[PDB]
Amino acid sequence: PPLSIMGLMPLTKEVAKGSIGRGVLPAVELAIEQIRNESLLRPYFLDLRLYDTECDNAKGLKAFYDAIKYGPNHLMVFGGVCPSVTSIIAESLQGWNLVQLSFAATTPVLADKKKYPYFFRTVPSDNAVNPAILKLLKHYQWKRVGTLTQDVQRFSEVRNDLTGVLYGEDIEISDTESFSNDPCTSVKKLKGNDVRIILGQFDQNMAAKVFCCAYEENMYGSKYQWIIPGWYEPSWWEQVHCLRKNLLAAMEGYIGVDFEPLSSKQIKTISGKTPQQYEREYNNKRSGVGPSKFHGYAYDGIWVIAKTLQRAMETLIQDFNYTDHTLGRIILNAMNETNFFGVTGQVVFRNGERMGTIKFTQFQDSREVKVGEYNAVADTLEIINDTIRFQGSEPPKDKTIILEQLRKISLPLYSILSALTILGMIMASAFLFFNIKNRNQKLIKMSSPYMNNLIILGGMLSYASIFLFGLDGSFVSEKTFETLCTVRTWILTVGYTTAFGAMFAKTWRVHAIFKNQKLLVIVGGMLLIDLCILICWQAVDPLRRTVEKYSMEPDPAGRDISIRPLLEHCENTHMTIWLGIVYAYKGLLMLFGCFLAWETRNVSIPALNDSKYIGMSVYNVGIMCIIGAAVSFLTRDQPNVQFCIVALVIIFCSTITLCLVFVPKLITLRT
Amino acid sequence: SERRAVYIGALFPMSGGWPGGQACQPAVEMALEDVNSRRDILPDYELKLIHHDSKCDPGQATKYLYELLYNDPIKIILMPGCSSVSTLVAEAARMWNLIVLSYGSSSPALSNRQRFPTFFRTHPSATLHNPTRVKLFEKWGWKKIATIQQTTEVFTSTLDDLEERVKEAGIEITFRQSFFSDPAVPVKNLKRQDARIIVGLFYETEARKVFCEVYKERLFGKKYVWFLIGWYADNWFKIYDPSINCTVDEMTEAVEGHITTEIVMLNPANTRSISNMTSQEFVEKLTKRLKRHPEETGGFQEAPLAYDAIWALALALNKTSRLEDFNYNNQTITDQIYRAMNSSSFEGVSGHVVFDASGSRMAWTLIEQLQGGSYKKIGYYDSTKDDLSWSKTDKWIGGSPPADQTLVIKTFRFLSQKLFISVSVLSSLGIVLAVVCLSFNIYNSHVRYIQNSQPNLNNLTAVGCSLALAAVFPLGLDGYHIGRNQFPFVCQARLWLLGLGFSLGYGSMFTKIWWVHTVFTLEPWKLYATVGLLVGMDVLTLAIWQIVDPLHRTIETFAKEEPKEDIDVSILPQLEHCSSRKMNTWLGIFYGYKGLLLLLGIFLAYETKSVSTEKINDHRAVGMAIYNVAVLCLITAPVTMILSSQQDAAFAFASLAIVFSSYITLVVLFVPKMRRLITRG
Ligand SMILES: CCCCCCCC/C=C\CCCCCCCCCC(=O)OC[C@H](COP(=O)([O-])OCC[N+](C)(C)C)OC(=O)CCCCCCC/C=C\CCCCCCCC
Ligand SMILES: CCCCC/C=C\C/C=C\C/C=C\C/C=C\CCCC(=O)OC[C@H](COP(=O)(O)OCCN)OC(=O)CCCCCCC/C=C\CCCCCCCC
Ligand SMILES: CC(C)CCC[C@@H](C)[C@H]1CC[C@H]2[C@@H]3CC=C4C[C@@H](O)CC[C@]4(C)[C@H]3CC[C@]12C
Ligand SMILES: CC(C)CCC[C@@H](C)[C@H]1CC[C@H]2[C@@H]3CC=C4C[C@@H](O)CC[C@]4(C)[C@H]3CC[C@]12C
Ligand SMILES: CC(C)CCC[C@@H](C)[C@H]1CC[C@H]2[C@@H]3CC=C4C[C@@H](O)CC[C@]4(C)[C@H]3CC[C@]12C
Ligand SMILES: CC(C)CCC[C@@H](C)[C@H]1CC[C@H]2[C@@H]3CC=C4C[C@@H](O)CC[C@]4(C)[C@H]3CC[C@]12C
Ligand SMILES: CC(C)CCC[C@@H](C)[C@H]1CC[C@H]2[C@@H]3CC=C4C[C@@H](O)CC[C@]4(C)[C@H]3CC[C@]12C
Ligand SMILES: CC(C)CCC[C@@H](C)[C@H]1CC[C@H]2[C@@H]3CC=C4C[C@@H](O)CC[C@]4(C)[C@H]3CC[C@]12C
Ligand SMILES: CC(C)CCC[C@@H](C)[C@H]1CC[C@H]2[C@@H]3CC=C4C[C@@H](O)CC[C@]4(C)[C@H]3CC[C@]12C
Ligand SMILES: CC(C)CCC[C@@H](C)[C@H]1CC[C@H]2[C@@H]3CC=C4C[C@@H](O)CC[C@]4(C)[C@H]3CC[C@]12C
Ligand SMILES: CC(C)CCC[C@@H](C)[C@H]1CC[C@H]2[C@@H]3CC=C4C[C@@H](O)CC[C@]4(C)[C@H]3CC[C@]12C
Ligand SMILES: CC(C)CCC[C@@H](C)[C@H]1CC[C@H]2[C@@H]3CC=C4C[C@@H](O)CC[C@]4(C)[C@H]3CC[C@]12C
Ligand SMILES: *[C@@H]1O[C@H](CO)[C@@H](O)[C@H](O)[C@H]1NC(C)=O
Ligand SMILES: *[C@@H]1O[C@H](CO)[C@@H](O)[C@H](O)[C@H]1NC(C)=O
Ligand SMILES: *[C@@H]1O[C@H](CO)[C@@H](O)[C@H](O)[C@H]1NC(C)=O
Ligand SMILES: *[C@@H]1O[C@H](CO)[C@@H](O)[C@H](O)[C@H]1NC(C)=O
Ligand SMILES: [Ca+2]
């Protein structure tokens, strides 16, 4: 009493996928003979009749019809490798009440149990790598990854299923791309979004192109991680046709995902032989033909039928024609109840899909090597802790860790310039005491003393200003910083306006007297103009602190540490026009004083004994002011050098004018 | 002599997605009765039909295909109705050497002679809508066409074909979209994208949602034109649907005025077919045979396709005719019947039946337009002869079709003409006075009064005034008079005339004032050397400006100044200019230098107000002049910078400043000397 099994699969050596059909024929004969030895289906015996489809839909359909007509009444359909024939047969299975159990069809399309209700398969679908990959993202905590898909339905199904798989989780798809012939455009598109971990879905031919495209963008090395399919041929990178060594450089570190050919557990299976014993038996029996990955998936397949038929005999078979509906339903239930340990692992079906294992591998310097594996029945991930190697210390990060640090003024430079300022201020305080002490004397009485003291006050205020405008804002809080930005503007404006109003009034009265109380009125008028300007500036639109962010240039490490220099300026909304009007109002007056000094450098009036040296003093002030303003606005981006230059300009200008004005008086009085 | 049976294997969809068989079965069972009783068509063989109900399901159709193929009698041809079953049978048939003949398979994929080597169909592919559409585009000159589609294989293949169909005719598909069930985001992208000619490929259910989303977006009206498919029901936009919030009248507003294309599945004329029937007589006979009403029977507008298909098969068999011995393993009869079918050309109930190179039937397409809540046929198109019959019954809002895009008329802002004319006349009159005062000064150089004042310096001042006055001509004219070509010489002449005019005219005065001042603290050597130095510095600065950064025309664009009560074409104004690449930095140093010079001149002229020297007699009057010059220059210096736009006001300020400065300078210097020479002799 024979039980026939209509087994469709490619066998001809002309068809490319023939290496599948022949490759699993040893393992099949391994199973069947075992079933004939142990006598499981006794008194019945299994008889698997083989039929060729040639992976052409017409020839496959004709083979199916010839099997149905010219053959004994088969109980179950088995096989189907290439997707078109298996789909066309699985869809029409219901017309004859025949259940099919495939071992090589990997198309996700066969998961729809409304269209293909009788189709089962022991090999995992292509999309089964999605719930695995997800767990891997949970393992390294990669939450930002971009997808690069080939424009084909086979990979488009996996790309579309990945979205539904990641749904409800803390994973974000920052970039989605699709490509057909040239991936480099989608490569640069992905790089535009600053992605570090990519999930690519494409065939073997597109793989080399996408990987050279990643090479071009420097999408390799430490900070990048590719996740691609793993059913590629071995040594696939060595395809005669991009550079080769650069290819092996860009490929290094990519992770491939596939399905596990055989269970790694050394446990006894349903047949009583561990996966390694079955592997040795298969390798011996297949002495000539080359191996195929699906070989174990054929072995358990026969078992998945055999046990099934046993349960069928439990429910009750030679009566079966293709009109029997209840028998087909019984066999369907019996196959659905399948739960047993076979060579490919636990064999259990969820809605006709095998709940199986996924295999993670990684390229290392010549070749692929296993690094982990995922169990979908337990939904657990198990990574070989040591074999995974990374260029950097840790797994690369998904997003960029940009820490906006704030550029700071050098503490030693500020301290040394502050010490020089205190020294100059002590000198000014000594000169003021020398002036006030010798006021009764005639020679100090001749040169206008009140204007000279006004000059000392100007220099002293400029020194306090030089204290102020280097605080950098890091020393102090924000509100104090804005208040001090206003205070230093006040103090520097007043200290310049008085110090130059004195030196201007003196030369003005020299010139006027040569042509042919009030000096203080002149300086007071200048002070009133400056005070009105400052109060208008303060009341209309006050200065506030703002932060400038630069080009994110530095990378002071081998880490992914990219800092943006955050510099700090206190400036107004329309501060350009304010600063322009102030600089112009003071520069015109400086030029005026310089011209008057040159005109009157030759006149000698005893009422102003120090007009000549005041000429050189106003020259100093003018030149130093021009240089300081130019080099200040020319170096807004560098705080340290700009502060150093401006502080040296202020110090040298003020100290040299004070020295020029007051030293000859003391050289005369002390001798 | 003997009538042998010749069997046809027919698969009729009695239900499913397309239940065409309910009317397709009688239309065949009628046609055979016409083909059998006629003794001139196939006098020897008698046609019969062994049909099965496929239910438009490949899984349910495979069993019936097996029942037909592997059961006697032998079938000579197959006939699949639906598209999927048709593809399956057309792919499988070549293993048995059987021709497949469909009547309702409209998928574009069925025109692939590599997969379906023996397939024919009387129903044209959906791609047949494309040659019509492109023609309509050329009929109205549209070249920017966006496409919105529903994610489905038929519409996707239609769009892929339309891309290459529009590439040949030199048209561009700018914006493409797709959507599975919700069309909101693609219509929003279209409205953002500003697409004018939109081609929409979606079913009826998605069509209602799409057009109510369009009513929300207001993607209808004058500018926007829509191309839809035309096999919907007539009142699809008036069908009640609770899945749409948008109402009936809003849909009548939105859909109204759109163009639709549909294959002509019945001959519009009143000619007779080979069966000796007309269209109306065939419809009458069919509804007589139908058990239900024509509106209830599925596939009623497809039945003439089945009739003509049976007639085409009959004519093929009659051409070949040996048919008694068909076996599934002989290819000879298959190729012969193939050559008979491929050479088919005959007038049936649906019109001229002829198959193209890929087995698809070529047929008319009717182009309709929705007017007043109803459809009105506006034209017909035959793609074989590429002839487009027009009835002139279409309508558009402004009497003409909307434009494919907004054109942007670039208008040029020109300086006013009466202003330029008046100001130029004023400047010419002023130049005349410079001629008079110059000649008067040169004639009387022998008198002692004019001898005392430095006459050559006043002559140089008059020459500078004349040059600055003459510089008003080029500084006014714009593209309106010059055009694009000669403009750089105009800008160069403006720059150089104004620069040298100011240089001489102000250098003479500043030299007079300086050399009075220096004497206050005399020979003509240094008096001439000073103006030499000043004019030389000016010439060198302007020459550097020339060599490093020569000036050139540069157009300035503006914001769209649309005019209303007109057609949707935005007017865009441009204001011509001409400037160095970095002109602010360049004219900056020049304005600063000249401003410092004018300020120092004002100060010196005030310092030497009361001073009196004989060798420079007129110097006090010079003081009265410089002020005016400086003031005007300052008041006119940044203002023209501020009023770069508004060319009219800028030219007014600049030229009035020039004219006033020149006039006042020429008066103040030369009038007193003139009257003193007159009244005294
Ligand atoms: C072709 C160009 C033409 C230019 C013409 C030049 C005219 C100059 C005229 C007047 C020059 C004096 C007029 C002073 C008014 C302007 C003071 C504004 C102060 C202020 O609110 O700050 C705004 C701005 C912010 O920039 P920032 O970089 O973000 O600063 C923060 C840096 N952090 C490190 C904290 C981040 O800083 C500045 O304005 C820079 C000012 C530079 C100092 C001026 C030179 C002083 C010289 C002598 C001092 C006088 C000595 C007195 C003599 C004594 C006699 C005995
Ligand atoms: C302290 C701050 C300010 C100080 C400055 C004060 C005075 C100016 C000093 C010297 C000026 C000397 C030479 C001019 C130099 C270059 C001309 C520019 C080239 C050009 O050709 O003009 C470019 C754009 C083109 O712009 P556009 O395209 O809109 O013009 C198209 C219009 N249809 O026009 C404009 O700049 C407007 C043209 C600029 C006009 C400047 C005002 C001069 C006013 C009066 C002149 C007084 C004459 C003195 C006589 C003395 C007799 C004793
Ligand atoms: C901040 C620093 C640079 C300021 C220093 C001010 C210096 C230059 C001043 C302070 C005291 C001054 C000295 C006072 C006394 C004398 C003695 C006299 O016979 C020669 C000049 C000499 C030697 C003076 C030179 C200048 C002097 C040294
Ligand atoms: C554009 C800006 C630079 C111009 C500023 C104008 C300045 C320089 C003006 C405004 C007020 C003027 C002062 C007002 C009062 C007098 C008294 C008079 O007996 C001598 C001149 C003197 C002392 C003036 C000097 C110049 C002065 C300070
Ligand atoms: C507005 C301010 C900056 C202008 C200042 C201009 C100065 C530099 C001008 C004014 C007067 C000029 C001087 C006028 C007279 C002479 C004598 C001549 O034999 C040598 C040049 C010399 C010595 C000039 C040098 C430059 C000079 C000093
Ligand atoms: C650190 C450097 C850049 C500062 C330089 C400051 C310069 C501008 C100062 C320092 C000494 C000054 C000079 C002091 C002496 C004289 C002699 C006098 O008859 C003409 C002016 C002249 C020539 C001064 C011009 C300006 C001057 C040169
Ligand atoms: C805004 C700034 C740049 C304006 C300052 C202009 C400078 C460069 C002018 C003003 C005063 C001028 C000085 C005036 C006096 C003399 C003495 C003379 O025997 C040699 C030239 C010399 C030393 C001049 C050199 C140039 C000078 C320093
Ligand atoms: C820090 C730097 C800029 C300060 C330099 C200070 C300079 C300017 C001081 C130090 C020594 C001083 C000199 C000391 C002696 C005298 C003799 C006196 O009869 C004329 C002034 C003169 C010639 C002084 C000019 C100014 C001077 C040179
Ligand atoms: C921007 C401003 C400051 C620049 C002005 C430059 C001025 C100072 C130049 C331009 C013309 C020059 C004069 C040209 C002619 C002479 C005659 C010569 O035998 C002595 C120098 C003297 C008298 C020059 C003095 C300086 C001068 C007046
Ligand atoms: C004696 C002469 C040479 C001194 C002239 C001073 C000149 C160099 C100064 C005065 C005004 C200044 C200008 C002020 C405004 C601007 C506009 C800005 O967008 C570019 C810089 C520019 C153009 C400056 C460049 C330098 C400038 C032109
Ligand atoms: C750079 C520009 C602003 C410099 C010009 C400054 C002007 C405003 C200066 C230069 C000469 C000055 C004049 C010089 C002297 C007098 C006479 C005095 O009894 C009243 C003030 C008055 C009338 C001054 C007013 C201001 C004045 C005109
Ligand atoms: C843009 C603004 C700052 C420019 C204004 C420039 C100022 C300084 C000019 C403009 C008008 C000039 C005045 C015009 C008229 C006179 C009368 C004359 O008998 C004395 C000088 C005097 C009083 C001038 C002084 C300078 C002056 C006030
Ligand atoms: C197969 O069994 C599973 C669980 O054992 C069940 O969820 C599924 O509905 C079954 N399928 C059938 C009975 O067709
Ligand atoms: C059928 O074939 C005969 C044979 O030549 C031909 O005369 C006749 O016209 C054909 N019938 C039709 C309808 O063309
Ligand atoms: C069809 O071909 C077979 C084999 O070549 C041949 O025996 C048979 O006679 C052919 N049929 C006809 C009608 O010639
Ligand atoms: C009929 O078949 C021939 C043979 O290949 C072919 O060249 C011709 O194009 C076909 N007829 C039509 C209308 O395409
Ligand atoms: Ca219609």
mmCIF file with all atom_site columns, N, CA, C and O in Angstrom, chain A residues 651-663:
data_model
loop_
_atom_site.group_PDB
_atom_site.id
_atom_site.type_symbol
_atom_site.label_atom_id
_atom_site.label_alt_id
_atom_site.label_comp_id
_atom_site.label_asym_id
_atom_site.label_entity_id
_atom_site.label_seq_id
_atom_site.pdbx_PDB_ins_code
_atom_site.Cartn_x
_atom_site.Cartn_y
_atom_site.Cartn_z
_atom_site.occupancy
_atom_site.B_iso_or_equiv
_atom_site.pdbx_formal_charge
_atom_site.auth_seq_id
_atom_site.auth_comp_id
_atom_site.auth_asym_id
_atom_site.auth_atom_id
_atom_site.pdbx_PDB_model_num
ATOM 1  N N  . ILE A 1 651 ? 46.584 100.241 26.147 1.00 0.00 ? 651 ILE A N  1
ATOM 2  C CA . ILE A 1 651 ? 47.630 100.452 27.141 1.00 0.00 ? 651 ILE A CA 1
ATOM 3  C C  . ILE A 1 651 ? 48.728 101.338 26.579 1.00 0.00 ? 651 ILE A C  1
ATOM 4  O O  . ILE A 1 651 ? 49.119 102.329 27.200 1.00 0.00 ? 651 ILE A O  1
ATOM 5  N N  . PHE A 1 652 ? 49.233 101.007 25.389 1.00 0.00 ? 652 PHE A N  1
ATOM 6  C CA . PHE A 1 652 ? 50.346 101.764 24.834 1.00 0.00 ? 652 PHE A CA 1
ATOM 7  C C  . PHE A 1 652 ? 49.933 103.188 24.501 1.00 0.00 ? 652 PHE A C  1
ATOM 8  O O  . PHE A 1 652 ? 50.661 104.135 24.812 1.00 0.00 ? 652 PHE A O  1
ATOM 9  N N  . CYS A 1 653 ? 48.759 103.368 23.884 1.00 0.00 ? 653 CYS A N  1
ATOM 10 C CA . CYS A 1 653 ? 48.286 104.713 23.574 1.00 0.00 ? 653 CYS A CA 1
ATOM 11 C C  . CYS A 1 653 ? 48.157 105.559 24.832 1.00 0.00 ? 653 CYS A C  1
ATOM 12 O O  . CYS A 1 653 ? 48.734 106.651 24.913 1.00 0.00 ? 653 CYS A O  1
ATOM 13 N N  . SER A 1 654 ? 47.425 105.064 25.835 1.00 0.00 ? 654 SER A N  1
ATOM 14 C CA . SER A 1 654 ? 47.200 105.856 27.038 1.00 0.00 ? 654 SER A CA 1
ATOM 15 C C  . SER A 1 654 ? 48.501 106.129 27.778 1.00 0.00 ? 654 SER A C  1
ATOM 16 O O  . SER A 1 654 ? 48.766 107.271 28.176 1.00 0.00 ? 654 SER A O  1
ATOM 17 N N  . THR A 1 655 ? 49.335 105.102 27.966 1.00 0.00 ? 655 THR A N  1
ATOM 18 C CA . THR A 1 655 ? 50.565 105.296 28.721 1.00 0.00 ? 655 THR A CA 1
ATOM 19 C C  . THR A 1 655 ? 51.533 106.205 27.979 1.00 0.00 ? 655 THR A C  1
ATOM 20 O O  . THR A 1 655 ? 52.230 107.007 28.605 1.00 0.00 ? 655 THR A O  1
ATOM 21 N N  . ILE A 1 656 ? 51.560 106.141 26.646 1.00 0.00 ? 656 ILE A N  1
ATOM 22 C CA . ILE A 1 656 ? 52.522 106.949 25.910 1.00 0.00 ? 656 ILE A CA 1
ATOM 23 C C  . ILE A 1 656 ? 52.073 108.402 25.873 1.00 0.00 ? 656 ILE A C  1
ATOM 24 O O  . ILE A 1 656 ? 52.895 109.315 25.978 1.00 0.00 ? 656 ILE A O  1
ATOM 25 N N  . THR A 1 657 ? 50.763 108.649 25.770 1.00 0.00 ? 657 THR A N  1
ATOM 26 C CA . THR A 1 657 ? 50.311 110.035 25.831 1.00 0.00 ? 657 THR A CA 1
ATOM 27 C C  . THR A 1 657 ? 50.498 110.614 27.225 1.00 0.00 ? 657 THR A C  1
ATOM 28 O O  . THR A 1 657 ? 50.935 111.762 27.370 1.00 0.00 ? 657 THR A O  1
ATOM 29 N N  . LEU A 1 658 ? 50.198 109.831 28.265 1.00 0.00 ? 658 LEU A N  1
ATOM 30 C CA . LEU A 1 658 ? 50.406 110.314 29.625 1.00 0.00 ? 658 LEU A CA 1
ATOM 31 C C  . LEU A 1 658 ? 51.878 110.601 29.884 1.00 0.00 ? 658 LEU A C  1
ATOM 32 O O  . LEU A 1 658 ? 52.228 111.637 30.466 1.00 0.00 ? 658 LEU A O  1
ATOM 33 N N  . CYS A 1 659 ? 52.756 109.709 29.428 1.00 0.00 ? 659 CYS A N  1
ATOM 34 C CA . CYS A 1 659 ? 54.187 109.913 29.593 1.00 0.00 ? 659 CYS A CA 1
ATOM 35 C C  . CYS A 1 659 ? 54.660 111.144 28.833 1.00 0.00 ? 659 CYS A C  1
ATOM 36 O O  . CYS A 1 659 ? 55.375 111.984 29.384 1.00 0.00 ? 659 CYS A O  1
ATOM 37 N N  . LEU A 1 660 ? 54.250 111.282 27.571 1.00 0.00 ? 660 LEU A N  1
ATOM 38 C CA . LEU A 1 660 ? 54.657 112.430 26.769 1.00 0.00 ? 660 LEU A CA 1
ATOM 39 C C  . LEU A 1 660 ? 54.210 113.733 27.409 1.00 0.00 ? 660 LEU A C  1
ATOM 40 O O  . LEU A 1 660 ? 54.932 114.736 27.381 1.00 0.00 ? 660 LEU A O  1
ATOM 41 N N  . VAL A 1 661 ? 53.019 113.740 28.000 1.00 0.00 ? 661 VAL A N  1
ATOM 42 C CA . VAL A 1 661 ? 52.487 114.970 28.568 1.00 0.00 ? 661 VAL A CA 1
ATOM 43 C C  . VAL A 1 661 ? 53.180 115.316 29.878 1.00 0.00 ? 661 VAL A C  1
ATOM 44 O O  . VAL A 1 661 ? 53.436 116.491 30.153 1.00 0.00 ? 661 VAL A O  1
ATOM 45 N N  . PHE A 1 662 ? 53.498 114.307 30.698 1.00 0.00 ? 662 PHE A N  1
ATOM 46 C CA . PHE A 1 662 ? 53.848 114.614 32.082 1.00 0.00 ? 662 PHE A CA 1
ATOM 47 C C  . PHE A 1 662 ? 55.314 114.390 32.432 1.00 0.00 ? 662 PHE A C  1
ATOM 48 O O  . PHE A 1 662 ? 55.770 114.911 33.454 1.00 0.00 ? 662 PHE A O  1
ATOM 49 N N  . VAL A 1 663 ? 56.068 113.635 31.638 1.00 0.00 ? 663 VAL A N  1
ATOM 50 C CA . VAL A 1 663 ? 57.440 113.307 32.026 1.00 0.00 ? 663 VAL A CA 1
ATOM 51 C C  . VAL A 1 663 ? 58.368 114.512 31.989 1.00 0.00 ? 663 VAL A C  1
ATOM 52 O O  . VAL A 1 663 ? 59.146 114.687 32.941 1.00 0.00 ? 663 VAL A O  1
#
